[PDB]
Design a protein around this motif. Structure first.
Motif, PDB file in Angstrom:
ATOM      1  N   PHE A  12      -3.789   8.118   5.584  1.00  0.00           N
ATOM      2  CA  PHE A  12      -3.280   8.188   4.166  1.00  0.00           C
ATOM      3  C   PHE A  12      -1.599   8.336   4.591  1.00  0.00           C
ATOM      4  O   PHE A  12      -1.004   7.751   3.470  1.00  0.00           O
ATOM      5  CB  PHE A  12      -3.539   9.751   3.557  1.00  0.00           C
ATOM      6  CG  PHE A  12      -3.201   9.674   2.179  1.00  0.00           C
ATOM      7  CD1 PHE A  12      -4.169   9.613   1.227  1.00  0.00           C
ATOM      8  CD2 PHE A  12      -1.846  10.017   1.816  1.00  0.00           C
ATOM      9  CE1 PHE A  12      -4.039   9.918  -0.140  1.00  0.00           C
ATOM     10  CE2 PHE A  12      -1.825  10.295   0.398  1.00  0.00           C
ATOM     11  CZ  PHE A  12      -2.813  10.192  -0.407  1.00  0.00           C
ATOM     12  N   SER A  13      -0.936   8.851   5.396  1.00  0.00           N
ATOM     13  CA  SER A  13       0.247   8.875   5.606  1.00  0.00           C
ATOM     14  C   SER A  13       1.008   7.762   6.366  1.00  0.00           C
ATOM     15  O   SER A  13       2.150   7.732   6.231  1.00  0.00           O
ATOM     16  CB  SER A  13       0.668  10.196   6.408  1.00  0.00           C
ATOM     17  OG  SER A  13       0.149   9.738   7.905  1.00  0.00           O
ATOM     18  N   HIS A  14       0.303   6.784   6.639  1.00  0.00           N
ATOM     19  CA  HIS A  14       0.769   5.257   7.074  1.00  0.00           C
ATOM     20  C   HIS A  14       0.349   3.940   6.272  1.00  0.00           C
ATOM     21  O   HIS A  14       1.124   3.096   6.598  1.00  0.00           O
ATOM     22  CB  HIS A  14       0.620   5.458   8.701  1.00  0.00           C
ATOM     23  CG  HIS A  14       1.745   6.217   9.323  1.00  0.00           C
ATOM     24  ND1 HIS A  14       1.388   7.545   9.484  1.00  0.00           N
ATOM     25  CD2 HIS A  14       2.729   5.826   9.931  1.00  0.00           C
ATOM     26  CE1 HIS A  14       2.481   8.180  10.179  1.00  0.00           C
ATOM     27  NE2 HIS A  14       3.414   7.102  10.631  1.00  0.00           N
ATOM     28  N   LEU A  15      -0.850   4.001   5.790  1.00  0.00           N
ATOM     29  CA  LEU A  15      -1.283   2.947   5.074  1.00  0.00           C
ATOM     30  C   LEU A  15      -1.757   3.008   3.645  1.00  0.00           C
ATOM     31  O   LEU A  15      -2.275   2.390   3.234  1.00  0.00           O
ATOM     32  CB  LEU A  15      -2.527   2.339   5.816  1.00  0.00           C
ATOM     33  CG  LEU A  15      -2.662   2.395   7.502  1.00  0.00           C
ATOM     34  CD1 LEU A  15      -3.760   1.952   8.007  1.00  0.00           C
ATOM     35  CD2 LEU A  15      -1.332   1.520   7.966  1.00  0.00           C
ATOM     36  N   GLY A  16      -1.132   4.078   3.129  1.00  0.00           N
ATOM     37  CA  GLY A  16      -1.231   4.244   1.591  1.00  0.00           C
ATOM     38  C   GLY A  16      -2.703   4.616   1.204  1.00  0.00           C
ATOM     39  O   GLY A  16      -3.138   4.815   0.269  1.00  0.00           O
ATOM     40  N   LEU A  23       0.765  -1.278  -0.024  1.00  0.00           N
ATOM     41  CA  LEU A  23       0.040   0.222  -0.034  1.00  0.00           C
ATOM     42  C   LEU A  23       0.903   1.227   0.179  1.00  0.00           C
ATOM     43  O   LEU A  23       0.319   2.152  -0.611  1.00  0.00           O
ATOM     44  CB  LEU A  23      -0.945  -0.040   1.198  1.00  0.00           C
ATOM     45  CG  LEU A  23      -2.167  -0.873   0.982  1.00  0.00           C
ATOM     46  CD1 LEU A  23      -2.776  -1.033   2.413  1.00  0.00           C
ATOM     47  CD2 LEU A  23      -3.294   0.156   0.091  1.00  0.00           C
ATOM     48  N   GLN A  24       1.951   1.379   0.714  1.00  0.00           N
ATOM     49  CA  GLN A  24       2.824   2.377   0.626  1.00  0.00           C
ATOM     50  C   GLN A  24       3.586   2.338  -0.480  1.00  0.00           C
ATOM     51  O   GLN A  24       4.079   3.486  -0.972  1.00  0.00           O
ATOM     52  CB  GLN A  24       3.827   2.288   1.888  1.00  0.00           C
ATOM     53  CG  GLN A  24       3.100   2.561   3.307  1.00  0.00           C
ATOM     54  CD  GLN A  24       3.024   4.105   3.615  1.00  0.00           C
ATOM     55  OE1 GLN A  24       1.800   4.768   3.333  1.00  0.00           O
ATOM     56  NE2 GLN A  24       3.910   4.641   4.287  1.00  0.00           N
ATOM     57  N   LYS A  81       1.481   4.262  -3.423  1.00  0.00           N
ATOM     58  CA  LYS A  81       0.364   5.636  -2.705  1.00  0.00           C
ATOM     59  C   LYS A  81       0.004   6.364  -3.843  1.00  0.00           C
ATOM     60  O   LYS A  81      -0.859   6.896  -3.745  1.00  0.00           O
ATOM     61  CB  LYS A  81       1.148   6.039  -1.552  1.00  0.00           C
ATOM     62  CG  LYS A  81       0.581   7.404  -0.970  1.00  0.00           C
ATOM     63  CD  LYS A  81       0.974   7.460   0.511  1.00  0.00           C
ATOM     64  CE  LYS A  81       2.496   7.605   0.625  1.00  0.00           C
ATOM     65  NZ  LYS A  81       2.780   8.307   1.883  1.00  0.00           N
TER      66      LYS A  81
END
Ligand code: NAD
Ligand code: NAD
Ligand code: NAD
Ligand code: NAD
Lengths: 347, 347, 347, 347
Positions: D206-210, A65-66, A69
């Motif tokens: 959003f900033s850690h799990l895409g 997922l990352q 993104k």
């Protein structure tokens, strides 16, 4: 329309998989990734590999997922293949399970993207979906996943930054006040050309209490610890095969219990969650130097906190090493050989 | 007070020098670095090397200053050795010049730290200062500066992040709005496992003008460009042998001159200062898709801006390449092969 | 589709206008704002008001654009009414002009939102568009624009943060190195319960040159300047009727000219653009404080830089005040007295 | 030496105290502040005042510590006066207690700084230390602490940013998935010219799990909550008499219990610590609109989450209000009257 599907263990994900997926995604309007897992097989693979920590299904989901993104046409799913014969003998039950999974998830794939020549006829005959071979000669990348698992530090340029945390050997340094932890961590990060993580407690104290710890209370002690983690996640995300940590959760738990008289459940949860490959414990042998920023000049309190650190390290069953050299150069040297032995390369 | 002096060309600085300096600095209360330069010799060395840009005396001073930022007992000086016989014939004039340099800078050294066994007697007999050999067998690092200069991409783990900008091959991609620059830059940074820099203009517009460009004026156009540079400095500081740049200063000059009628001296100074190893120019082949944010949806305005970009690229005498493939996959492949040819990795 | 139009000079924009626009935009799919300007009328209004700086059409556009940044259904337009008949004859030509303006802008409004009872029938008669009265009794806000223009510091809670920069009385403090500028600025921001801006030059030097000024070059001296502006924009955006600035662009221009021999066009452009309501100049009364960062310990160089500051302040014709008390308390009292007089309101 | 001592309960601290302390600190090399506290007296004072939250001794210590963060010559202490008859008849034992506190803390005061004419001879008689009167006529500030406690919103410009959190009336808005509560919070912050806090959960996702919640686990659900608090602390630190909060900890507890099946001790501790003056509950009046990011489009899940929110709000004994009106304009209006009634200032 024009749905593309990629299958893969992705254990671990490397730049060959990234090249495959990003060559496939520019050719389809939406790309679906389905990764399958098996508890025993993955456990054995982790056991035989050189990973620092064992990933979970959510962790590998987080990898994928990352990675993509900023590519908005990629979806990710996880599939369970328990009770199936291993490759390449469970080619019948696995296909049925994947078909049922796609039916549940509503996917109607049109193309399957792969980089195996012998697997393409098998995919066509079972899944009934046309397959497209991408880089069949492996021109862009030739390294395999097994070579990465066995020796990750020789193919470090092929491991993404999201997959890196499960390969980085994190080193945690512990020591008393004015023992030189920060300078030692900085020197180790410099000679090894890597990152480091500072103690978030000092930052929190200055940025929330005006620089004095008198206004520290129980409810504060769980921000600090969690804040400390936010530094660690950074240092391991950009490390050069090794990351250095200035302080463990044992020290913050010790401060909390010694000042407020009671422990904190979330700090203990972090202690259980965060396990370090190497832990180094310094001593109070160095003579006191008057500075002016800390009035806690008594060495009896330093020794008491050191002993409490030892007992709390023993309580959680955490292994550590002691460095007793008074001089700074010898301690730096000893840390160098400790890190080099951890690397696994002998004389 | 136990002064230690290290001499070195440091061209480029690598982790062996860092290990030397941090083994020496833990043993002395103050470490002085004296870096000698000669314009013609350094120019020839740059010519024979593979560096992207030629460092200046302030630039290498910046290398050494940023390396030891958190070590507070290290000072740095620069010395001129013009009109001196090369090493090792110039062991007499150089010694006098360096002695005069300490006299003018007020240094009274007590120890000289070096890693050459043969050079120690000359140091002792000329400067009259005892020398200390550190790692004389080069156990920690064995790579030499010449091997790094000739092939920096094979010893990439030994080059610090401050010295990296003069070795990173920066790629700048140019193209019209809504042509796919951002996704292409992201894909290239993904497959190459490196960093990238976004167009700071969009960020500035949203964060200062509410997301609309009607309120853009002449005096604003010099912020954006400078802000853009702050992104480039980031991307080159952490790149994996190559950094990708979403937009050049030619584009911001184009916008400024077309909307305001006059150029801007500072962005032109940036154009002169910032030179890119490879510049890629895309076309307006992709059809315009209605978005509701840009009223210049006509292909005539896009072609006008493209031609103005071409003429301004020619005005500064900047070489570039043109990619005309309509399909995205072929353009990605062409960019990959262009970057690979730039790498120079032979077969 | 359910288009709403709001008219107004919004000179300045206050919370009554904001309340009206929010109440209108909660009821329509998209809201269009059209603000008209006249050069002579706006110049006279600025002359008779108490604003610190004169807004331009782009500046008021920026006000309205930054206000509704997170409301995605609001558009903003500017209209010109030059060569206009005198009031009250300006109901027939103005209607034709606005009709034409909406013609080229493609707007097809369905509702006009206003808070004037007498203007509604004339709107219906001229523009032929039904009008909706919002808060005709002005229950939420009763203050008018004229009262805000005459006395803005008594209705400070009604002025948005985007409109604030043209009402904040910015105070810039200048002084020699190690004279106490920072502590004085902090004390003034404390007793007045407002914001302040630090000297960005020191931050830039530490974060880009390792904390030493030797690696400073000509091309650097512009970044500093622009960086300084980014602090000023912050301090004025959140000030409590007054903002304090630690250093002017005169000082950075002076440093650039002294250490390079030539000026910088962008620093001069910033000097022209940035005009301060009050400028305070300190002296070299206090003895120099040893820190270990400056090799220009001689007071002769300090006096030379002070005289060069004076001459460059006079060159661009910038007025300033001199504070000559040796003691710190009297200087703080004089600064408080000067700021209080510059407020202009006694009690 | 020149030690200066300031006494006061500073309950609450205002700009008159700041002016006193910063006039005293410029005249002494080191200033000491001593806050005396009594539990019952402070409880009664809080009861009779209009503060939103009751400060503790560490909280007011934090006030004084954060105010003088950049003034390096100010120290802060707390003193206990249990079993003391109030002023001005407890002038005998209080002096002895303060003398013993001086002995314990090692302070050797030379001057006492105060702004009371009658207390100066009393101070000289009991403590035997010369006193200096600063602003005896209260020219800079004439507002008293009682007037601030009774009506803080009329003297809002005199309350520092450290003391503000205990006076700001925080409003927490709760709503269903895609109910439009963020836009409502933005509008309320706009028309009231104040700050707001966004839901940190979306940012973390959003900033850690895409950007997908599939990879959310139990251990994650404690960072989010803590991160949410970091937003609240911001919104209350800069509010204009009122701050708006997009989501409570009840919602994150609800998500954690619904997905992971168990609660989290730290989020419950945050629930206990964080108490809101007004809580507004938005129900599911607005129909669900398909977007493609949530697969739980059925209103049954929304109803289940709302009911679980209601029961968990009742379990903690937290009072709230339900807004069932369909219209967005009507709901905005209703929130406006709710906030105005909370203000307590009628016609
Ligand atoms: N008996 C069973 O259980 C059943 C049998 C049939 C299917 N398989 C399934 O098939 C799945 C595929 O597993 P896997 O071994 O292929 O995982 P993998 O991560 O090794 O491969 C993922 C994809 O990436 C391609 N790839 C790998 N390296 C590449 C490179 N350097 N360049 C370009 N492409 C590259 C591979 O060809 C493959 O298509 C398995 O998850 C497994 O569950 C298992
Ligand atoms: N012009 C002349 O005739 C005169 C003659 C005598 C002195 N030299 C001067 O002496 C200076 C020395 O320059 P240089 O050739 O040593 O530059 P250098 O960068 O190669 O050496 C820097 C220092 O780091 C040491 N070092 C290098 N690699 C190392 C490693 N992997 N591990 C540990 N230590 C390592 C070196 O031994 C050296 O002491 C020259 O700049 C030159 O100006 C010149
Ligand atoms: N000579 C003429 O015929 C006549 C002269 C005056 C107006 N002008 C025209 O009128 C336009 C300017 O309109 P304006 O004077 O109304 O600008 P304005 O800024 O004073 O008002 C803008 C809108 O906001 C409303 N408003 C103001 N305060 C409010 C509050 N506290 N609460 C709720 N609503 C509030 C007003 O009713 C108005 O509708 C000019 O652009 C020009 O086109 C022409
Ligand atoms: N037990 C009791 O009830 C009683 C008994 C003894 C006296 N007091 C003690 O004496 C102290 C009480 O001091 P306080 O009541 O004055 O606290 P305070 O907060 O009202 O004021 C503290 C200081 O600030 C000064 N000050 C207040 N407003 C000012 C302004 N606008 N401008 C300039 N200066 C201003 C005051 O003159 C005072 O010196 C406490 O330590 C308290 O323990 C307590």
């Amino acid at each position: 329309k024009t749905i593309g599907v990629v299958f893969g263990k992705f254990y671990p994900l490397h730049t060959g998989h990234i090249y495959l997926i990003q060559r496939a995604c520019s050719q389809v309007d939406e790309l679906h990734i389905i990764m399958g897992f098996d508890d025993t097989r993955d456990r054995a693979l982790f056991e035989d590999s050189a990973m620092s920590q064992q990933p979970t299904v959510p962790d590998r989901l987080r990898w994928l997922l990352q990675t993509f993104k900023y590519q908005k046409n990629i979806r990710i799913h996880a599939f369970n293949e328990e009770g199936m014969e291993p490759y390449p003998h469970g080619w019948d039950v696995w296909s049925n399970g994947i078909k049922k999974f796609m039916a549940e998830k509503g996917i109607q794939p049109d193309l399957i993207y792969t980089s195996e020549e012998a697997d393409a006829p098998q995919y066509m005959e079972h899944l009934g979906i046309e397959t497209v071979l991408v880089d069949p000669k492996r021109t862009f990348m030739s390294i395999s996943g097994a070579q990465i698992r066995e020796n990750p530090f020789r193919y470090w340029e092929y491991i993404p930054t999201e997959v890196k945390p499960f390969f980085v050997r994190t080193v945690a340094i512990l020591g008393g006040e004015s023992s030189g932890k920060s300078t030692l961590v900085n020197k180790l990060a410099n000679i090894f050309n890597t990152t480091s993580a500072w103690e978030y407690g000092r930052d929190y104290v200055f940025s929330h209490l005006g620089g004095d710890e008198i206004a520290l209370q129980y409810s504060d002690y769980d921000k600090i610890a969690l804040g400390h983690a936010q530094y660690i996640d950074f240092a391991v995300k950009y490390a050069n095969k090794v990351a250095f940590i200035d302080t463990d959760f044992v020290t913050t738990q010790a401060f909390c219990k010694k000042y407020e008289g009671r422990e904190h459940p979330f700090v203990q949860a972090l202690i259980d969650e965060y396990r370090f490959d190497l832990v180094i414990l310094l001593e109070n042998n160095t003579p006191w130097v008057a500075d002016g920023l800390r009035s806690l000049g008594s060495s009896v309190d330093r020794k008491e906190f050191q002993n409490l650190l030892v007992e709390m390290l023993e309580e959680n069953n955490i292994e550590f090493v002691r460095v007793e050299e008074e001089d700074y150069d010898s301690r730096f040297l000893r840390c160098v050989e400790l890190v080099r032995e951890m690397m696994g390369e002998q004389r």
